[PDB]
Amino acid sequence: SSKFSNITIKNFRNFEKVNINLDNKNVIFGMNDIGKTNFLYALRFLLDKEIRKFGFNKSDYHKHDTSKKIEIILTLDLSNYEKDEDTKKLISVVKGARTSANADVFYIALESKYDDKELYGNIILKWGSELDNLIDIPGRGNINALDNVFKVIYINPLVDLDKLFAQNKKYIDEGILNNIKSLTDQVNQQIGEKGFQQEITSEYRSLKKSIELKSEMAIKGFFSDIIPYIKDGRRKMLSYSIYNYLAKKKYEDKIVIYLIEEPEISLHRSMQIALSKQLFEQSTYKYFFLSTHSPELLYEMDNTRLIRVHSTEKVVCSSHMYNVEEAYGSVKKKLNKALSSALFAERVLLIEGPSEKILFEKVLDEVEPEYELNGGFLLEVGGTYFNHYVCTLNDLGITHIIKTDNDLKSKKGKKGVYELLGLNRCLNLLGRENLDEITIDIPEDIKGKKKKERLNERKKEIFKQYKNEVGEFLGERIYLSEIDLENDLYSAIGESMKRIFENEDPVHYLQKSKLFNMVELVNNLSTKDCFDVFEHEKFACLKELVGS
Amino acid sequence: SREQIIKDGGNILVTAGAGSGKTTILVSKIEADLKENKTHYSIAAVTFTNKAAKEIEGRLGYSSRGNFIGTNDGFVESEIIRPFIKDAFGNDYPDNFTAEYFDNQFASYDKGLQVLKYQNILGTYSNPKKNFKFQLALDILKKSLVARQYIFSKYFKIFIDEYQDSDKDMHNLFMYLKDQLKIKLFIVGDPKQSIYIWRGAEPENFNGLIENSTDFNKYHLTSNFRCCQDIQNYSNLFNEETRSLIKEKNEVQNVISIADDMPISDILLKLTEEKQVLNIEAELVILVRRRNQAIEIMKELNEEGFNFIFIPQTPLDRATPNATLLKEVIKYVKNDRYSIYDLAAEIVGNLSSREIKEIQKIINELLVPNINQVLINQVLINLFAKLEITLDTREITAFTEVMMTNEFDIAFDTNEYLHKIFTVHSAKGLEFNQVIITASDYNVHYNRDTNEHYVATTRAKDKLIVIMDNKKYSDYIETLMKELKIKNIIKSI
């Protein structure tokens, strides 16, 4: 359902052989800053006439090897031709280069072979329906048929608004203009109305065989300079405001593709969210490619493809089609802001709530305070299932770790029925179906602390029944507690928790106020306590997060 | 009226007549739709002759929309047949084919495919009523999916000129684009049988659309659209059918009547200097019935300093099927600056460079001087034999007579003169800015010369000057002004 299928880059700079799936809206990010920039340049060379005329240098070839040929192919999908207007744009120019047998697909390729004597390898653009017999894109002079289809707008991080406005002023009443024109000449008559015009001529005439020297603008009219005025960081957003209005009117007849590199540069965090809303929520930017290091620039992300360039020197690329389902729509904004910062990390530990974050932040601080520097990240997920977070992180090649409590949820409208919520979420990551809800018989005289302890006994009983299902969880880096985190914490530092709280049952007291008591616990936690919790088998997720 | 015509954005069927009303409205309708539509879709205008396509392209201006302006044959060739013939029929068929109109006539559609597949040329059908190129183009569209996708993606509306000359195979393709591909069609044609038809013309397909088509929106064009309202009122009052369309105006200024009391040259000086109702810098032309009446007026004005050149009606100036083409052959023979490409542009279809060289060889026999009447007739038959057009006996003698003498040279001269005098039959076609006529020429009581008078009145564009030589002429005006209760229809000096 997207015109842009995938792009292939062969032997171009650090790209040995890289295949990346695509969509209308694409966002690229990762550690390799060189790979992200070369990715945008590889798209410009294929589609931007100004950057393509310069040809390939020796450095652009992969590993500076001129024998290997540079090849950049863009695969397109024309299946939605019946209801896509921009698809008909491409068809009208391609004409007979398509075949009816493969009418759904169309290829746009860039081939380059290097000449030693000419010290210069030219760029030959081919297209066609079949990848085997691509034909040269027809052209006459400095323009070809491809330049009539696609117009590439590259938004530099740093831009002067007055300079770009001078480019758009020309194309963007008459009886009124005539009065302004005659009045413009009225300026020059009053300016001359005098001692300098006559003395510079007497000096010029003796020097060289009328020197009036009027004033600019009045010669060419008021339209020559019409720079804007509002009523550094603020004017950057007005340049985007010009781009939206300009490109639609100027390039309505062709497909416009935006290449936005690092737009968060010299931009406030609040404006980054404003730009993110305009990129995804608004239909103003139909097709763009975005390179960003800013998590706040993805707060409003939806219906986009996320491309992650790996930190390795091989320049491996992992792409994910990020789409928020309608069921998650009521918590979409909360979910995106938490996941946006996790895309840039290397290992993400899925925790439930803030009480786990308060504990883990203190424990990690004593054991390994540089865990975020090396790519670790604590992502808290509350109320929702793990599938949306795991699918996005898995496709992007990000190591995901899950630590959740074994919980039971009472079904509404019926008493005595409890859903196996803790197991179902871990089973959902493995693709298995939700387990049947169970009914446990608790007497009416058993309430409060006595009631909770009996429910814990069912959790331990349920945990033992699915002993093999837990075995599959550990292979998938899923860590399901027997009862909950507080009981696993008691197993690691029971002597410390009893001394810290002086209460004979520290687990019961910790769960009274989970946030406050966890803060009270971490304040009195010893350094050996943090190492004991870290080294304990029940907390293997902390060892997997640091990556030892 | 015309404002109601251009506003319609759907399928438009236009009935055009009297000439030039079709071309000006077509160019204005095209450039107006280009301004309204900002999307990537383009328009396509098709004309039978290459001159009409070049005439439309010059008035439109820049075609940065990718709009196609060309010949009917060149359209289906460059947009349908050549791009998608290999998709429709396989890789066996060539896309570098060369279409020759005169050579390689065949009997069956299967035979022509072999000429294109093996002999690498696109030949015409032997039957004039059946078109092979349009039968091939329609067949290619049905066979090729990409061909249908490209036509829909490229053009949103198609303009067609002189639709009454379109054959049935040519008509089937246009209806296929409207019915199946849902492409808007702007159709311009003449419902009257007239004199000029393309060799495979069938007026019934055009007439059938006027009668039974619910999709098209029918419109009509005024015959004297270019003439001003005052001249239209004076012209339409002489014929009963035309008296109903004109509407009275409170003030009449364009039509001037002056009784001829002073000599002819003095009336010209009186209108030019004493009242200044005629400008000497604007083109002025005078109407006569016979050649002798023009000679005596031309000679009388040479004595008074007035300089004039008089165009006489040629033997070819006659309503015949090949009159228009025969005159162009004379213009190529008489004038050296008239190129052979200008002559080929008048020929129907987009002739190839090789076919142009063969036609040029036949006509080069007429460029030698003093080769008598017999050889002119054979060159003419040889010329029209290639075009598969028979020639009327009187058309041959009319062509021959013009070739012998230099008497009718300026009538076919490429140069243009400001002040002229023409006969009513001399410029039955072309229109002039300001015209002066005399009343004694036309018998108005018995309507013998009312048709020649109506033509005389419709030639003037801005200002018409009538001399009231005949009392019976003025009586017919005053009598009908009382029947219609018209106080003023004429401005008298």
Could you write out the DSSP letters of every residue in B39-77?
SS-EEEEEESBHHHHHHHHHHH---TT--EEEEHHHHHI
C-alpha to C-alpha distance for B420 and A361, rounded to whole angstroms: 103
Residue with tokens 């980054």: A272
* Chain A contact probe: residue of B145, B146, B182 with most A CBs at under 10 A: B146
Contact status, residue B153 vs residue A91, Cβ threshold 8 Å: yes
CA atoms within 13 A on the CB side of A373: 5
Write the CB contacts of A254 (distance below 8 Å, at least 6 apart in sequence). A89, A148, A149, A150, A151, B40
φ and ψ at residue B330, rounded to 5 degrees: -70, -40
| A95 and B CB contact within 8 Å | yes
The CA angle B48-B51-B54, to the nearest 5 degrees, is 105
Contact status, residue A35 vs residue A291, Cβ threshold 8 Å: no
Q: Count H helices, E strands: chain A?
A: 21, 21
Contact status, residue B242 vs residue B453, Cβ threshold 8 Å: no
Residue with tokens 């013998």: B448
For residue B153, which residues of chain A lie inside 8 Å, CB to CB?
A: 81, 87-89, 91-92
If contacts are CB pairs under 8 Å, which of residues 131-190 in chain B contact chain A?
Answer: 144-147, 149-150, 152-154
Helix axes B132-143, B168-179, angle to 10 degrees: 30
C-alpha to C-alpha distance for A13 and A35, rounded to whole angstroms: 9
Residue with tokens 């009122």: B233
For residue A85, which residues of chain B lie inside 8 Å, CB to CB?
A: 39-40
Candidate from B87, B95, B154 with C-beta closest to A92: B154
C-alpha to C-alpha distance for B385 and B4, rounded to whole angstroms: 45
* Largest CA-CA distance found in chain B, in angstroms, rounded: 82
Q: Which residues pair with B366 in a beta bridge?
A: none
Contact status, residue B376 vs residue B402, Cβ threshold 8 Å: no
Structure tokens at A485: 């985190």
Structure tokens at A7: 């792009």
* Chain B contact probe: residue of A88, A130, A249 with most B CBs at under 10 A: A88
| Full strand arrangement of the beta sheet holding A288-291 | A150-155, A255-261, A288-291, A25-30, A304-309, A317-322
CA atoms within 13 A on the CB side of A432: 12
CB-CB neighbours of B38 under 10 Å: 12
For residue B42, which residues of chain A lie inside 8 Å, CB to CB?
A: 92
Candidate from B65, B86, B150 with C-beta closest to A95: B150
Torsion angle, alpha carbons of B261, B267, B271, B274, to 10? -70
Experimental method: X-ray
* Chain A contact probe: residue of B37, B38, B39, B40 with most A CBs at under 10 A: B40
Q: Count H helices, E strands: chain B?
A: 20, 15
Selection from B391, B387, B410 nearest residue B330 by Cα: B410
If contacts are CB pairs under 8 Å, which of residues 305-324 in chain B contact chain A?
Answer: none
C-alpha to C-alpha distance for A125 and A135, rounded to whole angstroms: 8
CB-CB neighbours of B426 under 10 Å: 22
Q: Are strands A304-309 and A317-322 parallel, antiparallel or unpaired?
A: antiparallel
| Full strand arrangement of the beta sheet holding B12-15 | B68-71, B42-47, B155-160, B184-189, B12-15, B217-220
Selection from A338, A330, A332, A274 nearest residue A303 by Cα: A332
CB-CB neighbours of A14 under 10 Å: 17
How many residues are given for chain B? Answer: 493
- What single letter denotes the amino acid at residue A416? G
Q: What is the resolution of this structure in A?
A: 3.0
Contact status, residue A351 vs residue A321, Cβ threshold 8 Å: no
| B94 and A CB contact within 8 Å | no
CB-CB neighbours of A358 under 10 Å: 16
| B428 and A CB contact within 8 Å | no
Looking at chain A, which residue has its C-alpha nearest residue B39? A253
Measured in angstroms, the CA of A226 and the nearest CA of chain B are apart by 26
Q: Which residues pair with A127 in a beta bridge?
A: A108, A135
Q: Do B150 and A103 touch (CB under 8 A)?
A: no
Q: How many CB pairs under 8 A join A and B?
A: 57
Burial of A361 (0-12, 13-18, 19+ CB in 10 A): middle
Could you write out the DSSP letters of every residue in A431-462?
TPPPPPPEE----TT--THHHHHHHHHHHHHH
C-alpha to C-alpha distance for A205 and A211, rounded to whole angstroms: 10
Could you write out the DSSP letters of every residue in A363-407?
HHHHH-TTTTTTTEEEEE--SS-SHHHHHHHHHTT-EEEEEE---
Tell me the C-alpha to C-alpha distance, in Å, between residue B267 and each of A346, B303, B446. Answer: 102, 15, 29
CB-CB neighbours of A460 under 10 Å: 13
C-alpha to C-alpha distance for B104 and B110, rounded to whole angstroms: 13
Selection from B72, B64, B218, B88 nearest residue B158 by Cα: B72
Tell me the C-alpha to C-alpha distance, in Å, between residue B348 and each of A464, A484, B366, B372. Answer: 93, 91, 22, 30
Selection from B174, B195, B196, B197 nearest residue B186 by Cα: B174
Structure tokens at B76: 């289906």
Selection from A87, A92, A126 nearest residue A109 by Cα: A126
Residue with tokens 């052989």: A17
C-alpha to C-alpha distance for B476 and B478, rounded to whole angstroms: 6
Selection from B414, B412, B440 nearest residue B426 by Cα: B412
| A326 and B CB contact within 8 Å | no
Looking at chain A, which residue has its C-alpha nearest residue B40? A253
Q: Which residues pair with A30 in a beta bridge?
A: A309
Torsion angle, alpha carbons of A80, A82, A85, A90, to 10? 70
C-alpha to C-alpha distance for A472 and A466, rounded to whole angstroms: 10
How many residues are given for chain A? Answer: 548
- From first CA to last CA, the distance across chain B in angstroms is 34
| A253 and B CB contact within 8 Å | yes
Q: Which residues pair with A76 in a beta bridge?
A: A4, A106
Q: Give residue B306's region: left, alpha or beta (phi > 0; psi -120 to 50).
A: beta
